[PDB]
C-alpha cells in the first residue's frame, strides 16, 4: 500500500516480498496476459511502492 | 639544486658587446661534490664551491641544514 | 487554486457568445474553461474506418479562459481576486466581495 | 594520394583522443567553451 501506509512493520519487503512484488514483469506483462479491459501498465500508476523500501532500508540502518 | 642552502639561480640576462646584444652570459655551467659532514663520512655534499666558501662561521649546521631541516 | 470551486456558475462576456451561462465547468492545467461547452457548428475527425466514425459538430473545446465573471448569481462579475477567511482549515472557498461566501 | 576523410579508433589517441584533450591545457579550454559554457553536446564517445 504505496509504502508510507505500513511503517509499523518490523521487516522490509527485501525478506521475500521483493520478488513476489516484481515477478509479474516477466510472468504477466507480455501480450494481453495481465489484461485488456481492466489492467495494463501498473508499475507507475499504482505498483511503484517496491522502490521506496530501497531508500527506506538505508534510512532505517543508517539511524 | 646546488647552492640550495640559499635556494636557486638561473637568471637569463645578456652582455652588451654591440649595444643591446642578446648573448646570455649569466647561465652557470660547472658543478662540484664531496666534503666531511658533522658525524662520520666524507658525504656526497654538493657545491660550486659557494656553499663551502660560506662555511667560515658555520659549525656544520646554522646554514648547512636548511635542505635537511625540511 | 482559484478558490471558486468546481460546482459554481459562470458566463461568457469577453467574446461573441456574450451571455452563455452554465455551471461546474472543466478545470485542467492551462485548460481553456468552456463554461459548460458553448460551441454550435465545428467538425469532428475520422482516425477510424470502423463503424464508430466520430460524427460530432457541437460543444467541442470553445475557449474563454480563467473566468471574466465572479460566479453569476444575479448580475455582476467582481471582485474575483478577494481571498476570504477560515472555513476549512487547509483551503478556503469563496463566492464574491459582497456575499460572505457560497 | 589515398585522399582522405575516413573513420578509425586507434589513430585518435595523440590528436582526437577525448581524455588526452582533458590532459593537455591546450584541449581543456576548448572542450569547456564548446559544451560546458556554450549550451551544447558532443556524445560521439564509442
Amino acid at each position: 500500500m504505496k509504502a508510507k501506509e505500513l511503517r509499523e512493520k518490523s521487516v522490509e519487503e527485501l525478506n521475500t516480498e521483493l520478488l513476489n512484488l516484481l515477478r509479474e514483469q516477466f510472468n504477466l506483462r507480455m501480450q494481453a496476459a495481465s489484461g485488456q479491459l481492466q489492467q495494463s501498465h501498473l508499475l507507475k500508476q499504482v505498483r511503484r511502492d517496491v522502490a521506496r523500501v530501497k531508500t527506506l532500508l538505508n534510512e532505517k540502518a543508517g539511524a | 639544486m646546488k647552492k640550495d642552502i640559499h635556494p636557486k639561480y638561473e637568471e637569463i640576462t645578456a652582455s652588451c658587446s654591440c649595444g643591446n646584444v642578446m648573448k646570455i652570459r649569466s647561465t652557470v655551467g660547472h658543478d662540484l661534490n664531496l666534503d666531511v659532514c658533522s658525524k662520520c663520512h666524507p658525504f656526497f655534499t654538493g657545491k660550486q664551491r659557494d656553499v663551502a666558501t660560506g662555511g667560515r662561521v658555520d659549525r656544520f649546521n646554522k646554514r648547512f641544514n636548511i635542505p635537511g631541516s625540511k | 487554486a482559484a478558490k471558486i470551486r468546481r460546482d459554481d456558475e459562470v458566463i461568457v462576456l469577453t467574446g461573441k457568445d456574450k451571455g452563455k451561462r452554465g455551471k461546474v465547468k472543466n478545470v485542467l492545467s492551462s485548460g481553456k474553461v468552456i463554461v459548460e461547452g458553448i460551441n454550435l457548428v465545428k467538425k469532428h475527425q475520422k482516425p477510424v474506418p470502423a463503424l464508430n466514425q466520430p460524427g460530432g459538430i457541437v460543444e467541442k473545446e470553445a475557449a474563454i479562459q480563467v473566468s471574466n465573471v465572479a460566479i453569476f448569481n444575479a448580475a455582476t462579475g467582481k471582485a474575483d481576486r478577494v481571498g476570504f477567511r477560515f472555513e476549512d482549515g487547509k483551503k478556503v472557498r469563496f463566492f464574491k466581495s459582497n456575499s460572505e461566501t457560497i | 594520394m589515398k585522399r582522405t576523410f575516413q573513420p578509425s579508433v586507434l589513430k585518435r589517441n595523440r590528436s582526437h583522443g577525448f581524455r588526452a584533450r582533458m590532459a593537455t591545457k591546450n584541449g581543456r579550454q576548448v572542450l569547456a567553451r564548446r559544451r560546458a559554457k556554450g549550451r551544447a553536446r558532443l556524445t560521439v564517445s564509442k
Partner: protein, 99 residues
C-alpha cells in the same frame, strides 16, 4: 539460492518468437530477452528462482536493433538483447503458456 543478486533487473518478458515451434522437439530451447545488466552468469542464475522452472544451458546474444520514431531519420537502439533458455525434455507448457 541467493536473493541479493542482479536477477530482479537482469531479465525482461519471454520473446514468443516462431523458433519455439521449429526447434522445441525433444527439448524446450525457449526464447527470452534481458536488460543492460546481462553477463551470462546472471541469466544462468535467474530462471529457476524467478519462474519456478528447472533449466540446463543458457545463451546470451548481443542484438543491436536500430530504431527511428522522430520522423527526421533517427531514434534509438535501447539494450534490446535477446536470450535463449532450456526448459528440459517434456515439462513444456503443461500448466501455463507464458507467451
Amino acid at each position: 539460492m541467493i536473493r541479493e543478486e542482479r536477477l530482479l533487473k537482469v531479465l525482461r518478458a519471454p520473446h514468443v518468437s516462431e523458433k519455439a515451434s521449429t526447434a522445441m522437439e525433444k527439448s524446450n530451447t525457449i526464447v527470452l530477452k534481458v536488460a543492460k545488466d546481462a553477463t551470462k552468469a546472471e541469466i544462468k542464475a535467474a530462471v529457476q528462482k524467478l519462474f519456478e522452472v528447472e533449466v540446463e544451458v543458457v545463451n546470451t546474444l548481443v542484438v543491436k536493433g536500430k530504431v527511428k520514431r522522430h520522423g527526421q531519420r533517427i531514434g534509438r537502439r535501447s539494450d534490446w538483447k535477446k536470450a535463449y533458455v532450456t526448459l528440459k525434455e517434456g515439462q513444456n507448457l503443461d500448466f501455463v503458456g507464458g507467451a
